[PDB]
């Protein structure tokens, strides 16, 4: 609607905001909210023992779930910038941005790899 | 779902209304497996750009709908 981009009013993340970041964050929140439910639906679907009609219904429900319920849709962005390439998980930062931070001394224990 | 167990890939469609009265089903699914329950129903499967009219084959029963709506144009070379 007009007052918000997505259906649910989620907060903005602190520090660097970006449109893509906003999109990702919301998606992550919705996944967190509807994680157990999705799992339960998946279980009901992939069951040889249960009634077939019920499993079909569960599968249909899973199919009909939105873009923001999907775990696979989540992509690890850089947190300092808003890039989504070469994003290292141990400091949620992009390649160049990580290097910049590392050389400054922002990182907790990172330093030049001399051998 | 490809694997035989847990198959097929089912999607919600306006199937029963099409069966009652010949109204083509405009699918934007392209990953829904064709079933025996819709052979002889008119589908209008999405191609990216334009919806493609297909009367579902009796042999198409195993395949996906997107397999019958070819997205890219047939390649050629301008011999200049």
């Amino acid at each position: 609607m007009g007052n918000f981009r997505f259906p649910i009013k989620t907060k903005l993340p602190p520090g660097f905001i970006n449109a893509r970041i906003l999109r990702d964050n919301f998606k992550r929140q919705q996944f967190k909210e509807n994680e157990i439910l999705v799992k339960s639906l998946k279980f009901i679907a992939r069951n040889m023992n249960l009634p077939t009609k019920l499993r079909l219904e569960a599968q249909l429900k899973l199919n009909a779930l939105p873009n923001y319920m999907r775990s696979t849709q989540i992509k690890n962005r850089c947190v300092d910038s808003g890039h989504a390439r070469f994003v290292l998980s141990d400091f949620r930062l992009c390649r160049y941005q990580f290097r910049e931070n590392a050389l400054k001394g922002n990182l907790p224990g990172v330093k030049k790899g001399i051998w | 779902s490809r694997s035989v167990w847990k198959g097929p890939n089912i999607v919600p469609l306006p199937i029963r209304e099409a069966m009652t009265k010949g109204t083509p089903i405009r699918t934007n699914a392209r990953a829904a497996t064709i079933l025996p329950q819709f052979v002889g129903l008119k589908f209008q499967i999405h191609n990216g750009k334009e919806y493609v009219p297909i009367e579902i084959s009796e042999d198409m029963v195993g395949h996906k709908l997107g397999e019958f709506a070819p997205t890219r144009k047939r390649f050629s070379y301008t011999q200049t």
Binding site: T52, K53, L56 | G7, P14, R26, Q37
Partner: peptide, 28 residues
């Protein structure tokens, strides 16, 4: 015999009731 093949390898599930379950005519 594609339909026949389909019937063979989706036999345990038994695939009408199934049609009724998977036919919501709102979206088109």
């Amino acid at each position: 015999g594609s339909l026949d093949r389909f019937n063979k390898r989706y036999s345990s599930l038994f695939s009408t009731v199934e049609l009724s379950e998977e036919n919501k005519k709102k979206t088109q």
